[PDB]
Amino acid sequence: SGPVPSRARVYTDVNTHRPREYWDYESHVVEWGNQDDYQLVRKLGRGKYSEVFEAINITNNEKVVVKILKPVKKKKIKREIKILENLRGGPNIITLADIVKDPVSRTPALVFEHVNNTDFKQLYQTLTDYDIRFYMYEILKALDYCHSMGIMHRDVKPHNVMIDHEHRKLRLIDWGLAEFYHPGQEYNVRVASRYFKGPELLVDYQMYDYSLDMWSLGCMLASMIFRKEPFFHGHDNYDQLVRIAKVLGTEDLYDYIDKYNIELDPRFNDILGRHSRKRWERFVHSENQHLVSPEALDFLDKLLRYDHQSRLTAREAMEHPYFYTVVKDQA
Template identity: 45%
Template sequence: MIALRFRTKLVSVGIVVLVASLQWSISSDRAALAKARPYWNEAFFDAYDAIETQQLSISSSSPNDIAESLNIDDAIGVASDVYAAPVVDGESDIEDADSDLDSYEISWGEGEYAEVFKATDLRNNQICVIKVLKPVSMRAVKREIKILQHLSGGPNIVQYVDAATDSTGNSTVIVTEHVNNTYYRTLYSAFNDTEVRFYTFQLLRAIEHAHSRNIMHRDIKPHNLLIEHENRKLRLIDWGLSDYYDEDYAYTTSVGSRFWRAPEILVDYEWYDLSSDMWSFGCMLAALVFASEPFFYGRYNDVNQLIKIAEVLGTRDLFDWLDEYEIILPDTFSNVTSWYERKSWPEFVNERNRQRVNDDVFDLLSKILIYDHKKRLSARDALSHPYFDPVREEALAHANSVTKWLV
């Protein structure tokens, strides 16, 4: 069990801290960056390749001196002289806090909803990721931790290591495995047909594992996939919006990112289910196969996003689905009146993607990217689809590569 203690006066212990320094002034551009990126990990990974790591010896420096030298207001720490204790099943036992951030050598930066650090555990020399959540609903924090624990060891799911909360309950730290990720825009464009099949199969394995435990991720998108290509390792990360599915429960539709949101979420249908993740998966598969990311590009809002979907899947099926489930479109969708015929998948083939497309992937997409959420292919059934036949044996044999944490 890792118990973390962290202080804004962390510098006084004389450790060396590596802090990510973006090539632009973070303090001056932070507001613009946060406004432009709705989720912290989007900003983080978009900036990943532009990070210039700066090593500082801070044994005699104050936090203010460091912040000033980096032009960062709050580069280090989230709480003042508070101690972190392990969180087990949502409970905190302060007496069990027997280690602290002195055990870590830290590098990397900050996001809108969390501060995220790459760290080395000096006790075992293993690299990990420390995610310091900014003050949010403690219920949501406990849920994320519980879900990570529940999924621990599952195929292609980021490995949970530990969590801690300070004595005030205002700040929580989640520790997970580290993946040597390649920025997705660089990686995806270089994929061949076999690699698209391999990695989408591995993503499906993660989704199926979660769904088998009645867990919805609710934010599947490229930013939440880490791929260590040299080891053919994929991890589905960021379970902060995930939840347990109960068919008798209505869920918030304030989840996910627009380009990957299922139609039922776009129209505020609160009785959605696990199949919303499969829509997001289908969007990723289409984006990879057709080399068009995002595939459904609603530039402005949810209304425009639904129109972009209708331009591909047609309007007739949209309104048939709305009628079937007695879904009344919100007033904001009043201008969704144009009539669109359904397009066939081969219409999206061009010279850029011709080597990635085939009849099997067209069939798979036609069974996932459909309005009626009850008729979408499940993750388990999708894993058996012929599209994955050429890579299934290799993908299933591929080691899960879960890091064993040695303290």
């Protein structure tokens, strides 16, 4: 009767110690700027719930990015906005500069700093061992910050990392699925891209936490060092867990579901089976070898765990030997 509760190991009570206004985003009143300050230059991209454009702020002639929202519940808009305001000035977090509405179509639009983002296809082929370490460290700065500020991103994946390679500059974007961590709270598991979903989402364990982001970071790392995009290539949410089980093995999977008393979907009985835990060498080849080191594999192994309580925290990850070269060079 019932699954076993879980609390974050770190930053557990951080929102509790804050004024209510910090996390109680439904009570946030939105401060609207002037839509006539911005002229759209060109469309940059389309999304599930948004279209993005380059624009000009005509008052200062600064380049800017405008995310025009497709219709979504005002609660979810206030969440993204609140989270972005709370995180403003944090390391490698995209800056929200303004918020406007078309006066006619009443469609809201978020205005962001511009990053001169480099071709993601072109970039993720040209990356040295050192680059991966450097940018991974940069992402962890953002994740430790937002986690320490009581926020889970819940959509960490390469499309949500903007890199200006020229200036060695990284920004974590798209805070539209982000949520405030409160101990006890049961969250929606229908979040994140399939290939980056953590086991807790896949087995429908709802009392998850910041450590979700650390799984998805692990998925990113794996694809970058092994030059295999995506690393876990499931055909759907069920086969996604199987693709994970064929690598981390089923023994730790069933220990996980046992520890938390998770009612496993019966559909899984058929497809999951029995699989051994593989070693990482099975993914090392001559093409990717220059990216792979003992340090990288040790690090990766400690992100990619079924049990969310057992994964590295962002701060622990930043202290790992994989990053010694990077930490020395920063000071």
